From Swiss-Prot:
<comment type="subunit">
    <text>Homodimer.</text>
</comment>
<dbReference type="GO" id="GO:0016416">
    <property type="term" value="F:O-palmitoyltransferase activity"/>
</dbReference>
<keyword id="KW-0012">Acyltransferase</keyword>
<feature type="site" description="Role in lipopolysaccharide recognition">
    <location>
        <position position="43"/>
    </location>
</feature>
<keyword id="KW-0998">Cell outer membrane</keyword>
<feature type="site" description="Role in the phospholipid gating">
    <location>
        <position position="148"/>
    </location>
</feature>
<dbReference type="Pfam" id="PF07017">
    <property type="entry name" value="PagP"/>
</dbReference>
<feature type="active site">
    <location>
        <position position="34"/>
    </location>
</feature>
<dbReference type="InterPro" id="IPR011250">
    <property type="entry name" value="OMP/PagP_b-brl"/>
</dbReference>
<dbReference type="GO" id="GO:0009279">
    <property type="term" value="C:cell outer membrane"/>
</dbReference>
<keyword id="KW-0808">Transferase</keyword>
<protein>
    <recommendedName>
        <fullName>Lipid A palmitoyltransferase PagP</fullName>
        <ecNumber>2.3.1.251</ecNumber>
    </recommendedName>
</protein>
<dbReference type="GO" id="GO:0009245">
    <property type="term" value="P:lipid A biosynthetic process"/>
</dbReference>
<feature type="active site">
    <location>
        <position position="77"/>
    </location>
</feature>
<comment type="similarity">
    <text>Belongs to the lipid A palmitoyltransferase family.</text>
</comment>
<feature type="active site">
    <location>
        <position position="78"/>
    </location>
</feature>
<keyword id="KW-0732">Signal</keyword>
């Protein structure tokens, strides 16, 4: 009587996980070449090899008007080693009354930094962040309150939204 009606509850969870979400987020540093004069390179074709880094994660929707943001960025040194980084938080995306050209959001974001083998404890952190949607690209600023040097420094990072969903038959 219980295992019957209760089974449907779990069966719904296994079905969702089996399908997996439908969103691919990639955290990439904010760069800009520009330069005074487009300098060319002799010999050697294609792009140059230089491990910079990057992050990957997913998104979640909340019926209670909540936008969960999960992303994991990893940094690989040039001559030392690489260390991953996990981060999760919540933010509220606000859309204007006209079109989807400019997006504005705000909320809190948490981050955990761990290293070495799997035994020690990581380093949890909580800092405010702002969401800004401009064109096909997304920008997220990081705020950090405190009275030390500036106490009002604003950071900016580049983000690429990937929406993949092909096939429709198992």
């Amino acid at each position: 009587m219980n295992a019957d009606e209760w089974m449907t509850t779990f069966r719904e969870n296994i079905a969702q996980t089996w399908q997996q979400p439908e969103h691919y987020d990639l955290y990439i540093p904010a760069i800009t070449w520009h330069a005074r004069f487009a300098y060319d390179k002799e010999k050697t074709d294609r792009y140059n090899e230089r491990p910079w880094g990057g992050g990957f994660g997913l998104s979640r929707w909340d019926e209670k008007g909540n936008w969960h943001g999960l992303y994991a960025m990893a940094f690989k040194d040039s001559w030392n080693k690489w260390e991953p980084i996990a981060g999760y938080g919540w933010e509220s995306t606000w859309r204007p009354l006209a079109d989807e050209n400019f997006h504005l959001g705000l909320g809190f974001t948490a981050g955990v930094t761990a290293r070495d083998n799997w035994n020690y404890i990581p380093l949890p952190v909580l800092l405010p962040l702002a969401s800004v949607g401009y064109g096909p690209v997304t920008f997220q600023m990081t705020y950090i309150p405190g009275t030390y040097n500036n106490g009002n420094v604003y950071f900016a990072w580049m983000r690429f939204q990937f929406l993949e969903h092909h096939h429709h038959h198992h």
